[PDB]
Design a binder for this molecule. Structure first.
Ligand SMILES: [Zn+2]
Ligand SMILES: [Zn+2]
Lengths: 105, 99, 149, 191
């Protein structure tokens, strides 16, 4: 995302000819070096189990409706933990109100 | 609904030109609002000239009547006359609560 | 494109580009609009990247109907264009323009309409227009989050 | 470098634009008032108290318009075909002279966009004053251009044309006076 320093407008990319030169509707150009060459990308089985459920995992020990199991918490030694199942991979996560997160999630 | 939501500000632009002021004027702003409304219990005219005696539900069901309560409204009407050269003549009237 | 259509008394089946509605209320800078939608242009993330790129794509899409005011950064011109398009009883598109007071009447009526029609639960006063823009950006953010599955 | 509202710039703009200084200050606040009230300074709304005040966005749109079209005048040679407002200006100059506008014309945006965002959050009251001051500061920075001789006439006309376009459009959001409603070709007119 390139924004015009004067117009604060989105600039087209305009790959001409051997380089990348951004152009605004105001006629300004800023060009681009090295790190602007990424045209498009796609990563498979990524963006899942980190960004989709971060808030849900954080709030899970405080959710009354989450299922809980009898398992000792390593940190605060509470006799019960909150059991969490996410994804078509069925990843089981145990979280506690003390912040213990089972290093998974 | 009647008071807050039913406000009218409509302007008409005539073509009537039968008087000098009529030619000078091609506009009129009709503006009015209601501040009174109340539904009272159903009434029936016993002999078409009575004092609207009470209408009981079985009378409505038997006689095919509608068990409906009358709606009493009162409105404030503001009429503004718009002329050329910026003149503006306003006529205001207050209507008694009518049904 | 991401088109926003408002259906109420004064509006019907009229589809507006989102950035146009945003910059109708000032804030004509694209940076501000993208910040209103994605809530932050400075935290990279994987979600903000996708939303930012697709909002760019929506911004640069040429719609056939709102072409004259698509690239316009002038708030008054866009307000006039929408008032002309959406308000009835105005058959002459050129006769009224030569009168300044007719222009002012149309602009004021359109601004009052948009105050009363765009997210009325957010407020029905002109001082609540920026928080309406915040709420609309939040709605667009929620839709684009749902797109990500 | 610290910043403080320089009210002197606003008055200087008012004289050059032959409009009252209250008309300069009331940018973004013309709604709900007649134009006669704007110049009289009557019913001026209190300074903004929150970052969500639409006046802050309204004034910033005015500053953006000045910068947006100035860059069009800065980069007339870069356009495939220059816009109409600047076509009137540089119609009489050559292509080589058009390419000279980019270097000669100073860069006036400075750091308005970065400064405005911090002020809009930290001090909403001063965000309005800074934006208006910046709009006037750039105007006299344009208007007080002295050389080269050809660029004096081009810039001077543009600067006067721009703010008057900004003010007129800003004036067009004020209350409308008496006019013939028949100009819209139908039987009725609503509000
Ligand atoms: Zn630009
Ligand atoms: Zn624990």
């Amino acid at each position: 995302m390139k924004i015009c320093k004067a117009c604060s407008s989105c600039m087209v990319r305009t790959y001409v000819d051997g380089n990348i030169i951004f152009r605004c509707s105001c006629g300004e150009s800023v060009q681009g070096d090295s790190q602007n060459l990424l045209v498009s990308s796609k990563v498979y089985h990524t963006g899942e189990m980190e960004d989709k459920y971060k808030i849900f995992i954080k709030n899970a020990p405080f959710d009354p409706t989450n299922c809980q199991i009898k398992k000792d918490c390593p940190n605060c030694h509470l006799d019960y933990l909150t059991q969490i199942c996410i994804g078509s991979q069925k990843i089981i996560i145990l979280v506690c109100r003390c912040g213990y997160m089972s290093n998974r999630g | 609904i009647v008071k807050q939501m039913f406000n009218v500000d409509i302007t008409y632009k005539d073509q009537r030109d039968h008087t000098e002021i009529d030619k000078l004027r091609e506009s009129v702003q009709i503006q009015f609002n209601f501040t009174d409304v109340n539904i009272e219990r159903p009434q029936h005219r016993n002999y078409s000239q009575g004092n609207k005696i009470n209408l009981l539900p079985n009378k409505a069901r038997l006689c095919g009547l509608s068990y409906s309560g009358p709606v009493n409204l009162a409105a404030e009407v503001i009429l503004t006359a718009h002329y050329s050269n910026g003149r503006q003549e306003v006529k205001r009237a207050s209507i008694p609560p009518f049904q | 494109a991401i088109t926003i259509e408002i259906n109420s008394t004064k509006f019907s089946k009229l589809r507006i580009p989102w950035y146009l509605i945003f910059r109708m209320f000032g804030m004509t800078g694209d940076d501000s609009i993208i910040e209103q939608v994605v809530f932050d242009l400075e935290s990279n993330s994987l979600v903000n990247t996708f939303m930012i790129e697709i909002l760019e794509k929506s911004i640069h899409v040429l719609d056939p109907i709102f072409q004259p005011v698509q690239h316009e950064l002038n708030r008054e011109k866009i307000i006039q264009f929408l008032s002309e398009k959406v308000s009835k009883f105005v058959s002459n598109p050129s006769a009224y323009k030569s009168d300044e007071n007719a222009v002012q009447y149309l602009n004021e009526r359109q601004l009052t309409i948009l105050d009363k029609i765009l997210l009325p639960h957010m407020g029905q006063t002109a001082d609540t227009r920026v928080r309406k823009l915040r709420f609309l950006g939040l709605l667009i953010h929620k839709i684009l989050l749902v797109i990500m599955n | 470098e610290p910043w403080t509202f320089d009210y002197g710039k606003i008055i200087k703009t008012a004289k050059i634009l032959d409009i009252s200084p209250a008309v300069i200050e009331a940018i973004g606040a013309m709604e709900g008032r007649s134009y006669a009230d704007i110049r009289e300074g009557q019913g001026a709304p209190p300074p903004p108290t929150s970052m969500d005040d639409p006046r802050l966005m309204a004034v910033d749109s005015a500053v953006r318009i000045f910068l947006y079209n100035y860059n069009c005048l800065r980069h007339v040679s870069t356009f495939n075909k220059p816009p109409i407002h600047v076509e009137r200006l540089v119609k009489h100059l050559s292509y080589e002279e058009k390419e000279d506008l980019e270097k000669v014309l100073p860069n006036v945006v400075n750091e308005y966009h970065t400064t405005f965002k911090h002020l809009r959050v930290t001090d909403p009251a001063s965000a309005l004053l800074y934006s208006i001051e910046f709009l006037c500061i750039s105007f006299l920075t344009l208007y007080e251009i002295k050389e080269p001789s050809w660029v004096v006439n081009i810039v001077r006309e543009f600067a006067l044309t721009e703010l008057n376009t900004i003010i007129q459009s800003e004036k067009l959001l004020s209350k409308p006076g008496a006019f013939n409603f028949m100009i819209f070709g139908e039987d009725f007119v609503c509000s």
